[PDB]
Amino acid sequence: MSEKPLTKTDYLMRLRRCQTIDTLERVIEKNKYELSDNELAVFYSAADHRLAELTMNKLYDKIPSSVWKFIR
């Protein structure tokens, strides 16, 4: 809507659509090389938010520095 690659929510929303992390992770690698640096920025930023909640169970957007520092 605002940008060709869409917003972090556009990709992020489709990212969670996956069935599992193990399989979804496989697509992260392919998608990373699939699109370009422009859409990837949205794919990377979205993959982190998901990864964040994975560590906090189901909490994202409010991930502190301590929690993030733990998970890489």
For CA atoms 35, 38, 44, 47, give the dihedral sign.
negative
d(CA 26, CA 70) in angstroms, rounded, equals: 22
Closest CA to 55 of 69, 67, 65, 46: 67
Residue 2 tokens, joined: 């605002």
Domain total of the chain: 1
| Positions of E strands within 1-72 | none
- Rounded to the nearest 10 degrees, the angle between the axes of helix 8-16 and helix 37-55 is 60
DSSP label at 2? -
Closest CA to 43 of 70, 3, 7: 7
Residue 40 tokens, joined: 């990837």
Q: Which residues contact 31 (CB under 8 A, 6 or more apart)?
A: 40, 43
For CA atoms 33, 4, 44, 14, give the dihedral sign.
negative
**Domain limits at 14?**
1-72
